[PDB]
Design an enzyme around this catalytic site. Structure first.
Site, short mmCIF file in Angstrom:
data_model
loop_
_atom_site.label_atom_id
_atom_site.label_comp_id
_atom_site.label_asym_id
_atom_site.label_seq_id
_atom_site.Cartn_x
_atom_site.Cartn_y
_atom_site.Cartn_z
N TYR A 26 0.83 -1.24 -0.01
CA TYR A 26 0.05 -0.02 0.11
C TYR A 26 0.75 1.33 0.16
O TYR A 26 2.12 1.20 0.28
CB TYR A 26 -1.08 -0.06 1.18
CG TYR A 26 -0.33 0.00 2.58
CD1 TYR A 26 0.02 -1.04 3.21
CD2 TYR A 26 0.16 1.36 3.15
CE1 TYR A 26 0.72 -0.90 4.47
CE2 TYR A 26 0.38 1.48 4.44
CZ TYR A 26 0.70 0.32 5.18
OH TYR A 26 1.24 0.71 6.23
N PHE A 36 0.96 10.28 3.72
CA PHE A 36 0.76 10.03 5.36
C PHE A 36 1.37 8.60 5.45
O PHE A 36 1.67 8.26 6.95
CB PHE A 36 -0.45 10.27 5.58
CG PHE A 36 -1.64 9.43 5.23
CD1 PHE A 36 -2.07 9.73 3.99
CD2 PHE A 36 -1.82 8.30 5.79
CE1 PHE A 36 -3.14 9.15 3.76
CE2 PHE A 36 -2.77 7.45 5.45
CZ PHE A 36 -3.72 7.78 4.06
N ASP A 37 1.51 7.70 4.76
CA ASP A 37 1.83 6.15 5.14
C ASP A 37 2.33 5.53 3.63
O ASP A 37 1.86 5.71 2.61
CB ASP A 37 0.64 5.43 5.64
CG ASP A 37 1.08 4.13 6.43
OD1 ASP A 37 2.30 3.88 6.45
OD2 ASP A 37 0.24 3.40 6.95
N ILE A 56 -9.16 -0.61 8.43
CA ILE A 56 -10.60 0.18 8.36
C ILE A 56 -11.48 -0.32 7.64
O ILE A 56 -11.12 -1.30 6.73
CB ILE A 56 -10.03 1.68 8.10
CG1 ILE A 56 -9.40 1.55 6.74
CG2 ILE A 56 -9.11 2.28 9.19
CD1 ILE A 56 -8.99 3.00 6.09
N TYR A 82 -12.08 7.58 9.05
CA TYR A 82 -11.87 8.37 10.46
C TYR A 82 -12.60 9.83 10.36
O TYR A 82 -11.90 10.52 11.19
CB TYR A 82 -10.33 8.96 10.25
CG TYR A 82 -9.41 7.60 10.57
CD1 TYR A 82 -9.23 7.18 11.75
CD2 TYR A 82 -8.91 6.96 9.44
CE1 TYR A 82 -8.42 5.84 12.01
CE2 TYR A 82 -7.97 5.80 9.58
CZ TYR A 82 -7.88 5.37 11.02
OH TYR A 82 -6.93 4.28 11.15
N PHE A 99 -5.48 5.82 -1.81
CA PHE A 99 -4.71 4.58 -1.23
C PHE A 99 -4.28 4.11 -2.71
O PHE A 99 -5.03 3.98 -3.86
CB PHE A 99 -5.33 3.49 -0.67
CG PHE A 99 -5.65 3.76 0.83
CD1 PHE A 99 -4.67 3.68 1.46
CD2 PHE A 99 -6.79 4.35 0.93
CE1 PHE A 99 -5.00 4.07 2.90
CE2 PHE A 99 -7.25 4.60 2.48
CZ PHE A 99 -6.15 4.54 3.24
#
Length: 107
Positions: A26, A36-37, A56, A82, A99
Site C-alpha cells: 500500500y 501519510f503512510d 479500516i 476516520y 490509496f
C-alpha cells in the site's frame, strides 16, 4: 463508497476469501495533500488477514474486490475510516483517503 480504478494486469479470478492472510503493497495519499503512510519504505509488505476488523472499513471492502497481481486505486468516504474522530495528529477529522494498492499475496 469504494471506487476501484484498476491498473489492469493480474488474473482477475483469484479473489481473497475469509480465513486468508494476504500481502499488500500500500501507499497512502491525502486528497489535496501529501503522503501519510507507505509500505514501500519499510520493505515489510504488511501481512494481514480478512475478517477480524484489523484494517479500516474502506480498505477492507476494496481488498475483496481485487485479485492476484492487480493494482487498484482506492477512494474512501470520510465516514468509513476516520471522518468523525480523525486520527490524532496524523489524520484530520472529515478527511477523504486515497490509496495506491497492489495485491501480491499467498494462500
Amino acid at each position: 463508497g469504494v471506487e476501484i480504478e484498476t491498473i489492469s494486469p493480474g488474473d482477475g479470478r483469484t479473489f481473497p476469501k475469509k480465513g486468508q492472510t494476504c500481502v499488500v503493497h500500500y501507499t497512502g495519499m491525502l486528497q489535496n495533500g501529501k503522503k501519510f503512510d507507505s509500505s514501500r519504505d519499510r520493505n515489510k509488505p504488511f501481512k494481514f488477514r480478512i475478517g477480524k476488523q484489523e484494517v479500516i472499513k474502506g480498505f477492507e471492502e476494496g481488498a475483496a474486490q481485487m485479485s492476484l497481481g492487480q493494482r487498484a486505486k482506492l477512494t474512501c468516504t470520510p465516514d468509513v475510516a476516520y471522518g468523525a474522530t480523525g486520527h490524532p495528529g496524523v489524520i484530520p477529522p472529515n478527511a477523504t483517503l486515497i490509496f495506491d494498492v497492489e495485491l501480491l499475496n499467498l494462500e
